[PDB]
Structure 1
Amino acid sequence: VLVQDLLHPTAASEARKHKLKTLVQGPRSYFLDVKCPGCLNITTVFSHAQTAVTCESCSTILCTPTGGKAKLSEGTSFRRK
């Protein structure tokens, strides 16, 4: 473009871009707090778990892994933290 601001660009482009090629590399992941039906025992969880997470009170299931974002069980109420 031959002229532009490389210090105050748009969050549009900066969320479009990779997580490293921005002005400052930062993660695109997030955490959740999840409730399963029955025992509340609310559980903190990562988005990209790599694991099969379960509740401490009951071994029911919370989420399952993937190569990307995890796949939460069908009946589970999640809140982005």
Structure 2
Amino acid sequence: NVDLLYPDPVEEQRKHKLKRLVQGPNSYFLEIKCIVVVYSHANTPVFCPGCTSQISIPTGGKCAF
């Protein structure tokens, strides 16, 4: 019923990225419209062209806009 060679893709998402059968990032890129791609876990300030200032709110984990 269950085999470790082909883990359920959803059951594996609940585990730690290093104890997985293959180690992989937990981060990604996404698109935002003020057309610009931004890192999911941004920590440094980010600026956008028409913008006059920063639009990121750094946090412990995922950023906010």
TM-score by length of 2: 0.81
What one-letter code is carried by the residue in structure 2 that aligns with 1:31? F
3-state secondary structure, aligned to 1:64 = coil
The percent of aligned pairs where both chains have the same amino acid is 56
1:50-65 aligned within 5 A: 50-65=43-58
Higher strand content, 1 or 2? 1
Give the C-alpha shift of residue 29 in structure 1.
1.0
Q: In structure 2, which of residues 26, 37, 43 is the aligned counterpart of residue 44 of structure 1? A: 37
TM-score by length of 1: 0.67
Give the C-alpha shift of residue 11 in structure 1.
1.4
Kindly report structure 1 stretches of 4+ aligned residues shifted beyond 4 Å: none
Please identify the structure whose Cα radius of gyration is greater. Answer: 1
- 8 Å Cα contact 1:53/1:64 also seen in 2: no
Q: Corresponding residue for 1:66? A: 59
Give the C-alpha shift of residue 55 in structure 1.
0.5
Give the C-alpha shift of residue 56 in structure 1.
2.6
**Higher RCO, 1 or 2 (CA under 8 Å, sep at least 6)?**
1
Query: Taking structure 1 as reference, are residues 35 and 61 closer, same or farther at Cα in structure 2, changes over 3 Å only?
Result: farther
Residue deviations 1:55-80 (CA, integer Å, cap 9, x gap): 033224332211100011xxxxxxxx
